Amino acid sequence: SLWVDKYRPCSLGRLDYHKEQAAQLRNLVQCGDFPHLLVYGPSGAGKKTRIMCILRELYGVGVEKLRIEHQTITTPSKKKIEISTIASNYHLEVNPSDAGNSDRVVIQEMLKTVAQSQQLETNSQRDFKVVLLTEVDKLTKDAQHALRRTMEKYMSTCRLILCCNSTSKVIPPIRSRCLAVRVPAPSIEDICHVLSTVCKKEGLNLPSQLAHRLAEKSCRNLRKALLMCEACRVQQYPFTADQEIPETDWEVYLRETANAIVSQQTPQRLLEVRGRLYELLTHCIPPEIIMKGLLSELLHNCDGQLKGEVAQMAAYYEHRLQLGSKAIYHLEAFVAKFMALYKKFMED
Amino acid sequence: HYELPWVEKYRPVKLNEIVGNEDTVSRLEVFAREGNVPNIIIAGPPGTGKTTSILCLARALLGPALKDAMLELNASNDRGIDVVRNKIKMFAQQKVTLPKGRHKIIILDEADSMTDGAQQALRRTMEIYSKTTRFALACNASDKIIEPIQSRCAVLRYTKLTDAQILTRLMNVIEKERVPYTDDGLEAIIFTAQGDMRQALNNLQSTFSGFGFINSENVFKVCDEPHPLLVKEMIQHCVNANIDEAYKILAHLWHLGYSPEDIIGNIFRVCKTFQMAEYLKLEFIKEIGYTHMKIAEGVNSLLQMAGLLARLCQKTMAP
């Protein structure tokens, strides 16, 4: 087991950061009439850990005993789709975006059957069951419009803990029906404290310089920070303050793609960059993360009077990418617009 | 007995009563008088006389054997893959004793509605039994008929009827029905017909039944002026970035009760064949499609069409 899963806290009193929020979440779920929750924040902030802590607070220690259940759902086109589900004896965990645009068929048929049925054992299980819908910002708007009356009608016997990264992709009818719980990313000091605690529980000594560099390179992602720290011990156990931290391959590929964009501004270079963007889209990197990495590396090469135009173009083509269906058109359109703007700026 | 309307009452029964497309109709008259007619597909606008020409040719060729030597199939029939295999081929194989130069005629009216597979199955029964049976297809969109069938038949194309050609038939119907008229009323009937004899006869019948006299006011009280001639002036105003007259035409079309979808369809149909720059035409078509997506989404107001007109005027002054 990796360090991301070995030293994860179990209860709300064992969290290393957001302790006031942990006490407030303990006070919220004590009575049992707590509303639907919408846990949102950046990735790696600790949202899933706090959701499981809330579940362990509500139920016993049997929440952590999980299983995989596969359900076959019939579409209106009568094409059967099998969807996996993390399940326990007290709660359910569905990621409906695995059914893609059929996610509404998950909401309209599989969820309501959970909601319309009462619990078998009201002594062990409580008066309500909890369903965790993972990544509700990746849901289509039809699934979110199918969610709302199921949330309203069966609230007393079925609670929902939706989890997302951005609440801007959640429709206002769903956001009106649930309490929004914000989990910010841990600070550099919090990540340094967590990494030092993990290293001392592992019997290792971690310097403050290496912990600060891991926290800064992780971009306040504690999962990536723990994975980078474990990779650093693996590759070199004596922790030097200037030890090289390993990096992900797609980030370096994106940086070299942006360097190739900067190096030449020609349709042949645009063809090569389009090949690099297909390579990135092939490896299941989301196109918004490709846009963000492209902007973050292209702004390091622009001058002071071009960065605002580059950022506005990146936001515009990201919006057009979200409105469309083929990401390569909007990605190559952003690269071609940047090439035209950069050529105009360099020649004049 | 119930008297038929003038579209069905004054359907021509001989090929010399069909006006318009004079060379093709004359060659069909020669073929009806002589015989040995090839396979024929007539394409053209609605109301031109394609069904009338095919039925008159079949009647003049067959005479008294029309009941047993003709197979007429419509879009109201099945005519799927199982009917071309089993019914059309069995009629093509069927023995019918006919005079010299005369063959069995399989009329396939409105041949756009036939699927691709039925037209593929039609090919070899067209080619094999051609010494005993012939085919006479009528259609509107000639691209719906596949290229082997168009190669297996003579493709006759009917053009839209002119003003004098419809005026001759209208004079014949008026002299038959003793309808009083003026020249301006007949010009208004031609104007509302737009090359369609069915609409000309329907508008003449409606005006004569409603008012009993054909002048311009009685025609325009019940009939309507055509849409794209008025849309073309608005598109011409949008080309010169004249937003006031374009909105005047748009608001006049709005207060007449036309939906945004019909108006934007007429705008697109005018902008397809308008006489302007090609890059400006593509900019106009892209802006029209962008507005039509909003119309199809649900936001369809007068402000949205005015914004479309303003964006089309912006496309002029943006090089």
């Binding site: 049997g62 995989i68 259940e69 359900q71 399940a87 004896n89 959970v114 319309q116 049925s117 078998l120 | -």
Partner: protein, 261 residues
């Protein structure tokens, strides 16, 4: 070492068809008393128990309390290749990761061995309270299957009522209500047709239809069926499958409407 032999091959060929579309896996618990299966469905509505005692097997070897987890998508295809009146032997080693089913071919000339991978599932026993039910009735099995099938054409959910008069099935839909009753069937020659009442307190609860049809897919295993209900306990459907053991079905009720004032 787990090594068991069956006396009839039709027991598995009638008990796995009810679990084909009901539960996604079969977890067998091995003990000296017998084999116990407790499986909850993916929607947390239905609960299947199957206790087959060791006295009913042709032979039974069990040294350690072991638990095996098999899938249904492969066992359902394996069971159709098996025969009907042949013998089925189940074999499982102490440290191996596969379960072997050895039987006779339907051509009755060769022995067929089929191996299935053991799914390592992490479940816990939910725990039935085994409390005193407010209504216990006994019904014919095939008649109960025909009753559950006849309400499928009317509504998507059924209503079970049980007073001292008998058991009332209702199906209210957009078409119209379908109400049937069974009462006082002691004056018949067959002992399995005895529709009897055993308790006092009446109960009225709305249940699903699909899960009851899946429950009545296991009807020719037993002769009679038993139905147990209470005010809040889920519906218990009991089959006494011959001599080797018994099967229990638990079905949770639906959420009642707001009919108060």
């Amino acid at each position: 070492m787990f090594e068991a032999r069956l006396v009839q091959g039709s027991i598995l060929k009638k008990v796995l068809e009810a679990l084909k579309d009901l539960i996604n896996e079969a977890c067998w618990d091995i003990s000296s008393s017998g084999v116990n299966l407790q499986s909850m469905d993916s929607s947390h509505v239905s609960l299947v128990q199957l206790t087959l005692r060791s006295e009913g097997f042709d032979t039974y070897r069990c040294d350690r309390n072991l638990a095996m987890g098999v899938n249904l998508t492969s066992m359902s295809k394996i069971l159709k290749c098996a025969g009907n009146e042949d013998i089925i032997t189940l074999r499982a080693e102490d440290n191996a990761d596969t379960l072997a089913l050895v039987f006779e071919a339907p051509n009755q000339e060769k022995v067929s061995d089929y191996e299935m991978k053991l799914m390592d599932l992490d479940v816990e026993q939910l725990g039935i309270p085994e409390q005193e039910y407010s209504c216990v009735v006994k019904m014919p099995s095939g008649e109960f299957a025909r009753i559950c099938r006849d309400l499928s054409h009317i509504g998507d959910a059924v209503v079970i009522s049980c007073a001292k008069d008998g058991v009332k099935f209702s199906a209210s839909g957009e078409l119209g209500n379908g109400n049937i009753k069974l009462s006082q069937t002691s004056n018949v020659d067959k002992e399995e047709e005895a529709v009897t009442i055993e308790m006092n307190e009446p109960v009225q609860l709305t249940f699903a239809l699909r899960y009851l049809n899946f429950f009545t897919k296991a009807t020719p295993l037993s002769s009679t069926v038993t139905l147990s209900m209470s005010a809040d306990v889920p519906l218990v459907v009991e089959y006494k499958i011959a001599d080797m053991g018994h099967l229990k079905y638990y079905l949770a009720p639906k959420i009642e409407d707001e009919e108060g004032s």
